[PDB]
């Protein structure tokens, strides 16, 4: 049976296309707004912080870059990372994922139902959430497990902390050896014939082969990379924006995996942080509009005087 290909908009009439869009749109708002009570829907028990514990990261969207100045007069560049829709999806037991730490699954920003696989749509239907764009796996200890379906916000990170960033870098396509690896080129005018950017000799005569580690032209850029030791300067509450020092890998409007830094110096720097995550309902208090690091010159602060 050579069944023809179909899409959601094929058989829909002009009087029902606006209706179906309204139908799915109203479902998303009802589902998202019904998850805003993590501590009122029988959450899993919360344990006190312990040494060597790891928290849960987020999935955020990279907006752009801004300049930022400190109280000593130095200038720093911060990248605006916005958390749009972050929900923990599924929890994997310790003995079924790695044998040392449990795994928590976190989704990305909301996408349309009409362009996802049947299994993917069915999986979210049971949980009751709209489909996500990117899904990542986080390694979390057993003392910091979160019930799936619990929303996460940018307040999960407090200013002053050092965080990592993992995302796909900018893909530059099939680039030559000079751009990919940085080999020097041949001279341009001293008689050189049809050789200005070629790698040159690639091996030795005796071996009569090319070693597996040899550098050759090929794909460049579209791979997963991680940046370590990025300090968090400012946290925005209402818009859920995180400011990270330096440059994070990935192009604009991409999805970025954020986690606590794993560097040896930045160990156990979570006692003074929310655990296992920031629950806005439990505090019953309104956080400040913006959270500033102690060294950041605020926009509504008097001008710097070196007296």
């Amino acid at each position: 049976h050579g069944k023809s290909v179909t899409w959601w908009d094929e058989h829909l009439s002009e009087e029902n296309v606006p209706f179906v869009k309204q139908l799915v749109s109203d479902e998303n708002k009802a589902q998202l707004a019904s998850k805003l009570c993590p501590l009122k829907d029988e959450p899993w028990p919360i344990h006190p912080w312990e040494p060597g514990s790891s928290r849960v990261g987020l999935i955020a969207l990279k907006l752009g870059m801004m300049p930022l100045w400190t109280k000593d007069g130095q200038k720093h560049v911060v990248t605006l990372l916005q958390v749009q829709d972050c929900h923990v999806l599924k929890y994997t037991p310790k003995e079924n994922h790695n044998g040392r730490m449990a795994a928590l699954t976190v989704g990305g920003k909301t996408v349309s139902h009409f362009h996802k696989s049947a299994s993917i749509l069915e999986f979210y239907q049971e949980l009751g959430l709209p489909p996500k764009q990117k899904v990542k796996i986080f390694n979390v200890t057993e003392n910091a497990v979160i019930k799936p379906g619990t929303p996460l916000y940018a307040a999960h990170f407090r200013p002053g902390q050092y965080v990592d960033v993992t995302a796909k870098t900018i893909g530059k396509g099939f680039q030559g050896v000079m751009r990919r690896w940085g080999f020097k080129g041949q001279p341009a005018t001293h008689g050189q014939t049809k050789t200005h950017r070629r790698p040159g000799a690639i091996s030795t005569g005796d071996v009569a082969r090319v070693w597996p580690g040899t550098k050759m032209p090929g794909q460049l850029g579209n791979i997963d990379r991680t940046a370590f030791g990025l300090k968090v300067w400012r946290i925005n509450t209402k818009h859920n924006i995180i400011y990270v020092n330096g440059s994070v890998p990935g192009h604009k409007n991409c999805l970025v995996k954020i986690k606590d830094s794993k560097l040896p110096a930045y160990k156990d720097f979570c006692k003074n942080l929310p655990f296992p995550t920031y629950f806005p309902d439990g505090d019953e208090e309104a956080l400040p509009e913006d959270l500033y690091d102690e060294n950041v010159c605020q926009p509504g602060a008097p001008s710097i005087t070196f007296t």
Partner: protein
């Protein structure tokens, strides 16, 4: 560079018949509701468009005879009228194109 040995037909058959190099079938072929011919889903019907293009050429050919000069163009809107029809009140003030054949079914008067 020059080849070192002749490629055997066993190797050539594998390369010349690989699934990538074969012609892929098309699953987006549909029958046109109006004329019953074949067309793709995202492409206008070849028979129906050819029906329109032939008529459009006839209309444009009549316009050429109504403006002899190569740089004569109307400053007003244009309306095309077929046999057995007269200009409407809203159609007045516009150039009139007369065609002897009966008004085609697909073409709709306003």
């Amino acid at each position: 560079a020059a080849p070192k040995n002749r490629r055997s037909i066993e190797v050539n058959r594998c390369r010349r018949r690989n699934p990538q190099k074969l012609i892929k079938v098309k699953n987006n072929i549909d029958v046109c509701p109006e004329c019953g011919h074949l067309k793709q889903k995202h492409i206008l019907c070849g028979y129906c468009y050819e029906k329109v293009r032939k008529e459009t050429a006839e209309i444009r050919r009549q316009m050429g005879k109504q403006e002899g000069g190569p740089f004569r163009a109307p400053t007003t809107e244009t309306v095309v009228l077929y046999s057995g029809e007269t200009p409407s009140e809203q159609d007045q003030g516009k150039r009139i194109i007369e065609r002897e054949r009966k008004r085609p079914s697909w073409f709709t008067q306003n």
